[PDB]
Amino acid sequence: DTDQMAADMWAGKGGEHFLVWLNKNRQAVKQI
Amino acid sequence: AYFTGTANNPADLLAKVRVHAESLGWVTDRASASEWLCHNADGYWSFNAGANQFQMAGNTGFDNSLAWNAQPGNSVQNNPYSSKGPTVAQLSGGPFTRYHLFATAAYLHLHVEIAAGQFRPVMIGSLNKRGVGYTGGQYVCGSFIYTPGQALTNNWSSHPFDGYHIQYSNSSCMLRLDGLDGGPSPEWLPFDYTTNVPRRVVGPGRGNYSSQYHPDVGLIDASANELNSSTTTVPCAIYAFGAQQRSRYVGEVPDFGICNMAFLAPGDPLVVGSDTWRVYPLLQRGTATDFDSTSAWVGYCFRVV
């Protein structure tokens, strides 16, 4: 349940959304 | 002892075998990328690497200012042949599928697979004296092909230790027997039978050819036993003819033997006792009676240690 769909999702799908989230919040993440 | 590798060109084989010899303690008087003048406690030798072939010649002295084929007591000038040609081992150009090298302190044996099913042996060393008192015993052999496409094992062809051949220019293998019939000590006897030269040598080289001149040809033929599928090795007895056609047995090829490959595939192991043996085809795998396009089923046996 939380093994194949929670972590292996990073393979090729959960990367673009994480990148857009990163470009969304920068000052709040860039330090600590 | 036993080594394997691959070489895209002959020069790579030269480098690898020289590296192995030096690591084993062999003394090289002079070394080069393509020309060698090496020696050991038994005899002197020289080798040259051509575009697609080797040139080997025996030696008795050293002179750095002389060419590869002009060393003191060289075979070229001290042989009965009027052509005055050295030993030649014909190969191909380009990839060599694999080479198998047997290394010792007294002899070097090499078997190169130039291509799938094609094998070219190179043999060098000294015959086991077997308590026989005689000066010499150094033998250098090469592999020669008459013509690709046509019969590869024609009569004119020559093979290591061959006992029958037709050729006036080059010899596949040779032997040293000093002081024969009171002659000068430097004597490099070639393996010839049709020249009628007073002094000559003969061997089982061709194996079981129709016109092979050796009394053990039957032993080589019958090396394989049908009842129990057992194979026995046959030492390669060498004979030397005197001035008046009087033969004198000289010795046997160390750590070498011949057999029939009727029931054995290339490289098939038959460990007979504490010592293991490796068997490989001479030129190529064929049928029993294919004495023209291939080497039939003759197999060379080496002792692996």
Partner: protein, 272 residues
């Protein structure tokens, strides 16, 4: 037919081959369930499969790694379990389709790192030759010592005459002792290395912290050193000009600057 099969919409039978080579010793593995013969080489089938993660070529050595997965009992990776082999294990990857005798080379590189995450699996990180460009390139200093490895292409000193072949007398946890070296002055072998044959034409080498009498201090412990195997030991150069000339007589090739100038500028304050 390899390209034709790749373009084919119904004959796709991918099979990836790996070839690990170290000098005269080669290891062959395949990702299928049966052995494959290619170029007179037979690739063993690992009971459990060998698979990778993909090939990336983005121009960055740190990011363009290659990862191999194999079970715990892989022979080639088993060497790294105790100590990494001295020589690099070159790796070549071929691609071929079952039923075809033609293969295409895909990746070429050497082993970068290996680990056994699980008792039933392995992960091998293979690096390309491009990563070897991250280290500095200065390699030049104006100091008094030689600034050259004894025997390197700059020293031009032949160590073969100085080769010593011996059988060690006693081997301990950190010290290997032999009586033959006892006949040399203290520190003669300091800085040298010991080379011995492991398998075929490949040798594993270790270092000598210090040479004192009959006892040799090996860097990193004597683990993996055979107790009776033949060992070859070479000397070491301290790097001083006096040491370079008296021992090896290689002063003409001395790369150090002993007394040319240590401080002297021509734009200082007071020459006196």
């Amino acid at each position: 037919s390899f390209n034709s099969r790749e373009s084919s919409l119904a004959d796709g039978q991918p099979v990836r081959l790996y070839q690990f080579s170290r000098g005269a010793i080669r290891w062959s593995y395949n990702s299928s369930d049966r052995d494959i013969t290619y170029q007179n080489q037979i690739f063993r089938t690992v009971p459990g499969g060998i698979t990778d993660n993909g090939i990336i070529c983005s121009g960055d050595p740190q990011s363009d790694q290659f990862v191999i997965t194999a079970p715990a009992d892989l022979d080639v990776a088993l060497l790294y379990k105790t100590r990494s082999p001295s020589d690099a294990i070159d790796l070549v990857v071929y691609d071929m389709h079952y039923g075809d005798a033609e293969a295409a080379v895909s990746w070429v590189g050497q082993i970068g790192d290996v680990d056994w995450p699980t008792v039933d699996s392995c992960r091998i990180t293979c690096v390309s030759e491009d990563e070897l460009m991250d280290q500095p390139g200065l390699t030049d200093t104006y100091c008094r010592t030689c600034t050259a490895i004894v025997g390197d292409h700059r020293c031009k000193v032949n160590l073969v005459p100085y080769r010593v072949t011996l059988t060690p007398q006693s081997v301990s946890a950190w010290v290997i002792s032999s009586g033959v070296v006892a006949g040399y002055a203290d520190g003669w072998f300091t800085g040298g290395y010991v080379e011995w044959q492991v398998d075929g034409d490949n040798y594993d080498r270790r270092f000598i912290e210090q040479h004192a009498g009959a006892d040799l201090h090996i860097l990193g412990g004597t683990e993996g050193i055979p107790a009776g195997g033949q060992l070859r030991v070479y000397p070491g150069c301290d790097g001083l000009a006096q040491t370079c000339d008296d021992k090896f007589s290689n002063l003409p090739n001395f790369r150090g600057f002993n007394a040319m100038q240590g401080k002297s500028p021509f734009d200082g304050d007071q020459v006196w």
